[PDB]
Design a protein around this ligand. Structure first.
Ligand code: TMP
Ligand code: TMP
Ligand code: TMP
Length: 563
């Protein structure tokens, strides 16, 4: 007579309830109900909860206090015809659905796995309209990841306690992430600032208009004196030279809006524009999502549904007008790549209209809403001017720009050279030398590290945040003034791992393991075979590391005296 639906949080249960008829009964497991504990060694296998030596047999256990929840689901599941696992759409979500089906038990046919990337009326109806089945491959991909992380963490760390210090930790991806910071910390430590000069000139057009120029070439070669003498010498020539205009290339340019956000880009924009850290951004993104205000916050897809594009184009026509609406929609699909960007669930809901959301949560929505609306508006137009000037053997230039049509920038908050013809004489009024110095590489920010992680194909929309968090409370790196700093212990452990766990620390291999995980999720590889391969390369590394250093083993945090 009735159906039972299960979600992972009360917040998600409340929102989805508003869209499910009387035939359905929503219930939230209130978190993960079951999971792992909080050549061979029964002692090690028990602590890990997985057995690399008996074809990866696992020992999952119902989490503390959640035993009341199981019974809550159990008895509830019997007074129902069908059971719907409406956990989030990601692999982690697929595995949580699995654990739910396992615990409650029952014929596999009593279960369905619904997928949706936003909690709205029409998204909920279609999700339960054409329900799906649990996908064991995605579940196996998720456990594969969980098993190798456990292996690395529980088997490397003990070597580190013995070789380096007690309490240390090792992380499959985390240690690779720390490597990037350590390398960046070193580049900076060895950087040598270099001196170079620049010369500016103030002139007067024939009218009397002021014109500022920068010296670009001398003898047709790029101008860049490296000291104080060279500049004065150049300055001394520029003082007697006759200045004249020799081209006014007036060219029309445009700026295009960015694509709708994906996990990584949201984090960077939120951090750079709103000063939000990765943890903060993802926690608020989640609440907006579970509140039904935005699409799933874990994605690497910039695709937008026809419906979403139709609703926003409508908003653009009504609120901005025809000159802001492109002829055809901007397209940034099918079987693969069938997800969506982070966009509001209803373009007609303004940040100021969010009910149960805090100030910064509304601000994040605004940033998301603006990016979304802008991505579907026309480009902005400018008329760029470039004045090249000649003076003796020198060449100087001045650039200028005038806005002609705001286009997409209209939905963003509210925010020029004189007239001269080729051949006009400019009067020199003043010359101004300026000394500068090459700066060192920028320090990673929480988000810009994720950015670097993404381009190296190391992270994953659903792991970036955890990766940033997990490497901070361990003494390897620290964030000071919102920037990363490598700690001495971070370098100590990093050099050790690169020396005795090369494959594990290699970027390409780490990015490759993500591909391998995708092949599992796509039934192109079998999770256990993939795990056996990983363990094989791992233990060979580990066995070598545990040996005395005189036999090539890991270096202890030594430093001995004359004796
Ligand atoms: C939890 C998790 C999710 N995902 C995601 C992001 C997307 O929502 C989806 C990709 O779809 P797929 O698993 O069918 O290939 O799963 C990963 O790729 N790795 C993970 O570890
Ligand atoms: C040091 C610092 C930088 N920022 C910046 C400067 C950049 O605009 C942005 C991150 O820059 P990045 O992508 O080059 O790493 O955030 C802050 O917002 N707060 C800070 O405390
Ligand atoms: C993408 C984009 C965002 N912004 C933003 C994001 C911030 O929410 C906003 C500054 O905050 P404000 O609107 O509250 O004054 O500016 C731009 O100014 N230009 C852009 O091109």
């Amino acid at each position: 007579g009735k159906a039972l639906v299960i979600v992972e949080s009360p917040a998600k249960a409340k929102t989805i309830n508003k869209y499910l008829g009387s035939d359905y009964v929503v219930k939230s497991s209130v978190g993960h109900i079951r999971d792992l504990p909080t050549d061979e060694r029964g002692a090690l296998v028990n602590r890990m909860g997985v057995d690399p030596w008996h074809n990866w047999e696992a020992h999952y256990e119902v989490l503390p206090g959640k035993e009341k929840v199981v019974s809550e689901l159990k008895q509830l599941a019997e007074k129902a015809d069908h059971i719907y696992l409406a956990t989030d759409l990601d692999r982690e979500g697929e595995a949580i659905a699995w654990h739910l089906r396992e615990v409650i038990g029952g014929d596999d046919a009593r279960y369905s796995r619904v997928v949706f990337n936003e909690i709205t009326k029409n998204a909920i109806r279609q999700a339960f309209n054409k329900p799906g089945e649990l996908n064991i491959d995605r579940v196996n991909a998720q456990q594969a990841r969980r098993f190798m992380d456990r292996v690395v963490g529980y088997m490397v760390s003990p070597l580190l306690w013995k070789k380096i210090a007690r309490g240390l930790s090792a992380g499959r991806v985390q240690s690779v992430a720390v490597r990037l910071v350590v390398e960046r910390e070193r580049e900076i430590k060895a950087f040598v600032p270099e001196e170079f000069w620049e010369v500016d000139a103030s002139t007067t057009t024939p009218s009397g208009e002021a014109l500022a120029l920068q010296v670009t070439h001398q003898n047709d070669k790029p101008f860049r004196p490296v000291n104080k003498e060279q500049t004065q010498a150049a300055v001394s020539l520029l003082e007697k030279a006759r200045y004249s205009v020799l081209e006014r290339e007036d060219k029309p340019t445009t700026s295009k809006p960015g694509a709708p956000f994906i996990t990584s880009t949201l984090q960077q924009a939120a951090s750079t524009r709103l000063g939000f850290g990765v943890k903060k951004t993802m926690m608020m993104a989640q609440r907006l999502y579970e509140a039904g205000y935005i699409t799933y916050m874990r994605t690497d897809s910039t695709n937008l549904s026809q419906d979403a594009v139709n609703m926003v184009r409508g908003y653009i026509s009504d609120n901005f007008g025809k000159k802001y609406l492109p002829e055809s929609p901007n397209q940034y699909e099918n079987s693969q790549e069938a997800h969506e960007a982070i966009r509001p669930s209803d373009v007609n809901v303004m940040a100021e209209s969010l009910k149960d959301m805090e100030a910064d949560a509304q601000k994040l929505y605004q940033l998301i809403w603006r990016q979304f609306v802008a991505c579907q508006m026309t480009p902005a137009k400018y008329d760029s001017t470039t004045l090249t000037v000649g003076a003796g053997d020198f060449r100087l230039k001045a650039r200028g720009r005038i806005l002609r049509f705001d286009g997409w920038t209209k939905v963003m908050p509210a925010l020029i050279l004189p007239a001269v013809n080729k051949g006009d004489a400019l009067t020199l009024v003043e010359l101004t030398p300026a000394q500068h110095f090459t700066k060192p590489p920028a320090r990673f920010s929480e988000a810009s590290l994720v950015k670097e992680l993404e381009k190296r194909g190391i992270g994953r929309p659903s792991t970036y945040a955890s990766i940033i968090s997990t490497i901070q409370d361990r003494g390897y790196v620290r964030v000071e003034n919102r920037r990363f700093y490598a700690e001495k212990m971070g370098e100590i452990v990093t050099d050790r791992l690169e020396e005795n766990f090369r494959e594990l620390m290699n970027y390409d291999f780490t990015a490759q393991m993500e591909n391998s995980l995708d092949q599992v999720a796509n039934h192109e590889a079998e999770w256990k075979a993939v795990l056996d391969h990983f363990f094989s390369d791992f233990t060979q590394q580990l066995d070598k590391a545990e040996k005395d250093p005189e036999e090539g083993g890991m270096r202890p945090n030594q430093m001995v005296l004359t004796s």
